[PDB]
Ligand binder design. Sequence first.
Ligand SMILES: CC(=O)SCCNC(=O)CCNC(=O)[C@H](O)C(C)(C)COP(=O)(O)OP(=O)(O)OC[C@H]1O[C@@H](n2cnc3c(N)ncnc32)[C@H](O)[C@@H]1OP(=O)(O)O
Ligand SMILES: CC(=O)SCCNC(=O)CCNC(=O)[C@H](O)C(C)(C)COP(=O)(O)OP(=O)(O)OC[C@H]1O[C@@H](n2cnc3c(N)ncnc32)[C@H](O)[C@@H]1OP(=O)(O)O
Ligand SMILES: Cc1ncc(C[n+]2csc(CCOP(=O)(O)OP(=O)(O)O)c2C)c(N)n1
Ligand SMILES: Cc1ncc(C[n+]2csc(CCOP(=O)(O)OP(=O)(O)O)c2C)c(N)n1
Ligand SMILES: [Mg+2]
Ligand SMILES: [Mg+2]
Lengths: 872, 872
Amino acid sequence: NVPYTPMRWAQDVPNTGVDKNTRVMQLIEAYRSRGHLIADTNPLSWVQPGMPVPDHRDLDIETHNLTIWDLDRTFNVGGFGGKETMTLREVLSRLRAAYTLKVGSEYTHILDRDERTWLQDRLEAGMPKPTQAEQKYILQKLNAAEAFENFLQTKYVGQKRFSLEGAEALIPLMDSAIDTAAGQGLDEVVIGMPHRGRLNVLFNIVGKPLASIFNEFEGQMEQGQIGGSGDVKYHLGSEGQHLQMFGDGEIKVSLTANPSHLEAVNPVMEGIVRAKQDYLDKGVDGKTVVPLLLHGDAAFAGLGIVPETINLAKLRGYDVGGTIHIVVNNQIGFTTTPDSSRSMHYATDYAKAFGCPVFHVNGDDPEAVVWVGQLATEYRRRFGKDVFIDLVCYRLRGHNEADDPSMTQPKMYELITGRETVRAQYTEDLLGRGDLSNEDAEAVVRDFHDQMESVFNEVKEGGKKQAEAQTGITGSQKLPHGLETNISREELLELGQAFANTPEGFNYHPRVAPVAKKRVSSVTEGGIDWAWGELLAFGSLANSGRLVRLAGEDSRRGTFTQRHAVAIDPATAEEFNPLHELAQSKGNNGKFLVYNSALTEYAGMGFEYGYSVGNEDSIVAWEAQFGDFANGAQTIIDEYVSSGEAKWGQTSKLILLLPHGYEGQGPDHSSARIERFLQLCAEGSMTVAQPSTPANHFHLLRRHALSDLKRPLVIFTPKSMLRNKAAASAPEDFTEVTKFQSVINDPNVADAAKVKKVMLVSGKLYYELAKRKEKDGRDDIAIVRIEMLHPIPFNRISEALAGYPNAEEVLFVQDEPANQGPWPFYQEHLPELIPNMPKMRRVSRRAQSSTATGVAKVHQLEEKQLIDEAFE
Amino acid sequence: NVPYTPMRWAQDVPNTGVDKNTRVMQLIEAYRSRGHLIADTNPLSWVQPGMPVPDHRDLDIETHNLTIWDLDRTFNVGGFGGKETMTLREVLSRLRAAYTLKVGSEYTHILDRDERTWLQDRLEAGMPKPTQAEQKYILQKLNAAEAFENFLQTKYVGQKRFSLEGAEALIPLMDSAIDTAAGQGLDEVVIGMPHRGRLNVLFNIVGKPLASIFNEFEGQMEQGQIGGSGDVKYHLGSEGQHLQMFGDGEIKVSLTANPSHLEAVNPVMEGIVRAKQDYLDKGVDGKTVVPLLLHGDAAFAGLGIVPETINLAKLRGYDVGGTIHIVVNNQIGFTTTPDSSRSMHYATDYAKAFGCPVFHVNGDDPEAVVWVGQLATEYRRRFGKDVFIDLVCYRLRGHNEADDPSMTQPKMYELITGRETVRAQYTEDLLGRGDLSNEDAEAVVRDFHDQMESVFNEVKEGGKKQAEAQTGITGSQKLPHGLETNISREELLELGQAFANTPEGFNYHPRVAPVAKKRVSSVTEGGIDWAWGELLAFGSLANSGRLVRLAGEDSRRGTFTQRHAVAIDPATAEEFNPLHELAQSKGNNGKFLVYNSALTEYAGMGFEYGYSVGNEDSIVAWEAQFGDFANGAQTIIDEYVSSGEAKWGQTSKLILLLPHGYEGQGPDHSSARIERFLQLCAEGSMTVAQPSTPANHFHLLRRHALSDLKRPLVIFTPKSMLRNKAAASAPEDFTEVTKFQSVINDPNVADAAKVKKVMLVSGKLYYELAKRKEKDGRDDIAIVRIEMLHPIPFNRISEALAGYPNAEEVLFVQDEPANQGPWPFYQEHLPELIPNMPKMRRVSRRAQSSTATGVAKVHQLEEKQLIDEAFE
Ligand SMILES: CC(=O)SCCNC(=O)CCNC(=O)[C@H](O)C(C)(C)COP(=O)(O)OP(=O)(O)OC[C@H]1O[C@@H](n2cnc3c(N)ncnc32)[C@H](O)[C@@H]1OP(=O)(O)O
Ligand SMILES: CC(=O)SCCNC(=O)CCNC(=O)[C@H](O)C(C)(C)COP(=O)(O)OP(=O)(O)OC[C@H]1O[C@@H](n2cnc3c(N)ncnc32)[C@H](O)[C@@H]1OP(=O)(O)O
Ligand SMILES: Cc1ncc(C[n+]2csc(CCOP(=O)(O)OP(=O)(O)O)c2C)c(N)n1
Ligand SMILES: Cc1ncc(C[n+]2csc(CCOP(=O)(O)OP(=O)(O)O)c2C)c(N)n1
Ligand SMILES: [Mg+2]
Ligand SMILES: [Mg+2]
């Protein structure tokens, strides 16, 4: 059992052509670059049958024209090993000790010279010898891991737990990293992980009490929100503290909630870290909250969310100082082996796309694992980049504890069954080298078992409760009754002037200058448009002292060239952000931050959801280029935004701004899918709205920000109505009207006793119906608008209908096809809530498999047909 | 304007320590590895202000301790340039000519030695000098590209076209690749691409007639399906032929349809290629259909679907022999620059994760572009791997033709406005070197303009039609009236015996052997379960002579250990596929292929959709591990499966198998989201079903395969009912019952005149209600099952209800919450279709924000409450 190729027999060759010193330097370069291909990193003696084996002929001395006859000759090596001269025997010895034992390293692809040199120097010095106290501490942690697993196996046989047996070195690796961070003087560590070994990490790394875990297994579950539905035990989070064992440091440790969908926690935990860093406010030399992210081998290579999230690492609004990644490589999926899972040689090969180092380590050598953890945390602090660790290990049982893995992998489980564990091997090694006594070794086991037995007995004394029905979360948070959302006239004029107070030699571009002038004049003369209404809301909130963040694709300028939140000078390329300047000059330390995202919907929306969880007092908004591209983030909408409160008691106030409207631009630029969002709503989980005037959009945003109802808000924003002059607002609507309106009654009814038809509408189709009513002179019609879709404002609709006592018909008019839009939701729910209302009649486009037509002339013909049908 | 650093002044150094020959070899290695960092590949003199600049100190002779005083000394170079000895002046000259001009190359990261050597030899030989005929052919193609763009600009000013101006070298690059493939003797080329330059590619590469394109712009659109909705002009496909200009070869060229969602065509076009290759059947040395895939720079770096699809390249059921990728790098998104779009240095850096070569080429040197196209197509044919081309160019106008790019990028558009085009520059170069006359150069322009003017005038003679309403696609395909789907008794016994005809020294695993015995005995005694029903269907179809493909996560064994389509011997690890063996021994050349996918839902489902489009006569099925993970493929469901026929006239017969059932395993293992699928249905777009017996599943699958209705099928499959003994089927149900049943009436009604309540149910909740009816002895109840959900079988439901003439109530009973499951769809539609039916009453779980509870005791309490409510 020796892992190297034997030395071969050959004749001595002459020193002609390429010199032999050149050949020895080429050998040094080969080991530094490709020596990981023959390193002892696998605990099993296993080669997977269907995977390609890379060529490694570069690592034998024959390929470089050297022979056994050169081993005692001396050569110039140019500073290798801190020496100018050396023998080929000593060169080979050093190379093999550094690059072919229990740690394999990839770092030669890095472009910067100082980075490469730092890693090279530390890997060739070697791992320093640990003290006896340190060695005993590693043994305590290994014991805890294995003992906990065995206890659960014995007391709860059938129950699913997802064990860590085979990979118990993870616990001392994570401990090493957290301890190193505490010594650097940092503030917090945030963890995200999957199912494999979660209950072990909660107890041994985070510090969740043992009583809690035992209760979970007996069927008593901790309640997150009053009347909540809940979730399985391996999807929950917790908080704790970690004290340094051989030091005076202390750090905080947190673990985040997640669903079963793998790798969906990656963008969410990055956002939590960024929000925490921003609150501490320590600058570029800060970055004092560390992200620690765990993966599995099949998931890391397969799912596309992983590289999509790593691509945000060095961008302006997303940087968090680097991420430490750990891949638990146990050489198996569920019933699938690596030959069917990836087309890369290693699972961690995405690192080479981003220019980052990789360390592969044997999971049956605990002292090497502790060294790699320390080295990774030091690299992050110095260079501010991502680092990847590959922990090679195995899975002792099946995928779960009810499965038989021999049916599909017979030969692999001949090697696994009946091995000795990593705790047993390490105890034998320490007693052999005389580093531990037998009394000590036996105490370590006895003490921990007594602790667990004690707690278990205490938990069984208390009787088990019986099942009870779950009520719901509708009334678990209060509504802001009697809150006023208007600003003063002085405040409005100051916001307007921000666009006139340009810096010293700044000028606007000629096509942007008219927009700025209109903003300064409109706050006294009238004609405020949609974009200016939105910015007035965010600006007012930043003045009071809040952090406002807006992110999305092309969101600084606007997709429809409407926003201009940051302006650029054509002559010098200088930038200007008016509303941020005004906020910083009022002495409440408010901020307005606008960022242009990368081209992603899954990672984008996930990052903003996380920001809202990490700072409860911030105002965060994500914008989509068109609302039709939000189906690329369906996982986040379904698993986090719509359902997080009911499952885990985790609350959010994220704002989604989704453009919507039927204007003839085709099926992928027409519908944000209102029907889908209204399906997900129940128990008052989120607010859904489609306003028709800038002032009403202003009041909606301010009500959300100043209330104490911590639930999301989904708004459907316009595209063509952005520049419609019938939709503009007057200053009195921002300063004298006090509240947001959920139903707007018709403002052009002469006599209410002559009305015989009521139309209900939502959005931009109002302005067409109104136009036609004026032209034809109809005094028997009244058009009523619905601005808030969920919850249903049934008291207001009832009040409006009651104001027309001679009405015989009610029509519901929409632009969307009959199987889309708000009609399906309203035809089900509204008749129950208003019993005395006449039967409703739909007027819409016909039902369709697609969203809209692709021909523009057909669009115009349909619109004419629709409006004609409404007016008899 | 010289691009190199000047030679510096220094003293001569002594030849001590590391020898100077060693230093010259290190310089050669540096240029081969990192010389692309200083190559002349950018047409503009532009450096983006916020992007990091890599260190390239390795490429100057000072860092290797050499000086101007060494330039005329001679050194040993070890075969470089086919010489044993050389001067430092000649070495530098050759390195700079090979690695620093108009082509930059990355290939040193490749692990195989023979690959590296092949590339190295071809890049150092250089580009061969082209003939005069070849040169004139390149000028014709450049002219065509630019001329077409200018014509459309002039005749249709406001209209959106997404121009290729700035990147006209794409047309000769694509032409070079297709021409090289025709010379190799291959069969077809399949293209997928986005919006940028689509109408140009349709006319100049594929061969779509010019009349068609002009008509599109005048508002006359070609119809795909009778009564279809349509789509915008830059989303359509076409077919054509390509004849070799200087050869006797011929090849077929195809372009595929796609939506606006970027990069969603990547898995779909890979599947089309695989299906075409399988039909030709030429073996491992075949692979004679070439995939050619075009991208943009922002999309390639940002979206996660790109690397997810490249990861399928070398897997067993997905390999297509390599893909040629072209990235059109025009240094801008919409209003976003590379500093805000990626954290990689180049957009094509994913190549280094997969071990593939990259070529960067200047888009203003057309002869170099034609060489790189040829070299890439040769590499694919020899090594069977992916290859990446980065075409560096610019965008002359805005994102569309209505946008002003100076508002956000002032300095970049000072360099662009008023340049001379690539056609103009090339004409000037050829007239300078005397390779073309002026008469020739003027004819090239005049002839092409005359051609276009002719066609345009002909198109305007015919009058323009007026708009007309679109009818729908419901009746555009026929239903299979009077088709019988039963097999003979002889056929059933033969299928059973397949599991007894093991190979010579094969034995089953002890936990798989009982399943095999039961399969052999059940075809004569009874008790056929769900999995065996499914396999009997697929086997029967493979016997008749069809290619059957089944793919999904853990689909060979089954997620619930139920299928066992391939078995493994514990002693030798040999594999056995019974139903494939039987099919190949009947002389119709049928196949049963089962594959275990990688861990992806977006790329998985997309690949199977593509397979169904590329071979209309195959039976393809995709399976999900649980139906709750299908929201990861929402883009494919919404943009291709649900809506492809109505938009493009593209038909498919894909089968989705989605597990579903409420059994207490929590919110991410309970619901496949039936309500979402029933929203997407209209105009008879697809079939949705939830059967309750194995025999009925058999008949459904066979009806779909033998009919002429080319639409998808979505089935909701069980989890616990897989092993329920009340649900098993008898042999007569496969051989004497002729058709699939859409409604199954109650089989335990003694007297029909005593019934006073009818319950409607779908799925596994039948077996609980039936149980309770027997126990309590209720003869006033009748339970009726609905097996097909869409379309609604309203004639059968009416017939069933009419059979109970004294009924007073109808109850609709489901397990799902009230805002989920089939109730929302049925409460809207069924009362209209059956006017005389009593008012329906819902019995279900309460409405919820999440899918299901996380506590198991609460699940059991809810189920009891539900069944009690049903029975008064
Ligand atoms: C979904 C969420 O975010 S929380 C909703 C929780 N409650 C429910 O779902 C209960 C069922 N729903 C209902 O009874 C009704 O739909 C109501 C009461 C919410 C609204 O019906 P109406 O009375 O017709 O609506 P109206 O617009 O007059 O609202 C009444 C008050 O509720 C407030 N309100 C209503 N919806 C919201 C909301 N989403 N956020 C904040 N305040 C709200 C209004 O500001 C108003 O306050 P006021 O006292 O200052 O006038
Ligand atoms: C959705 C698709 O893929 S095709 C939809 C095309 N048709 C429509 O949408 C019309 C509207 N729908 C209807 O009129 C009704 O729902 C029907 C006629 C389709 C079915 O209603 P019922 O008559 O109650 O159902 P029933 O099960 O008896 O079907 C009658 C016949 O249609 C056939 N059929 C019904 N649905 C399908 C289907 N999805 N695929 C194949 N055949 C079908 C049955 O096999 C049967 O044929 P038979 O005469 O040989 O026995
Ligand atoms: C998005 C998604 N797809 C599929 C699944 C189903 N699933 C659960 S575990 C698993 C295997 C995971 O393998 P690996 O990442 O190696 O984890 P290990 O069990 O080895 O820790 C799969 C496919 C899932 N939970 N989420
Ligand atoms: C999935 C998706 N997200 C967003 C968009 C909106 N969008 C259309 S074009 C575009 C810019 C694409 O940039 P690039 O890939 O460089 O294309 P180019 O315009 O340079 O050809 C964006 C974000 C889209 N069509 N699809
Ligand atoms: Mg694994
Ligand atoms: Mg671009």
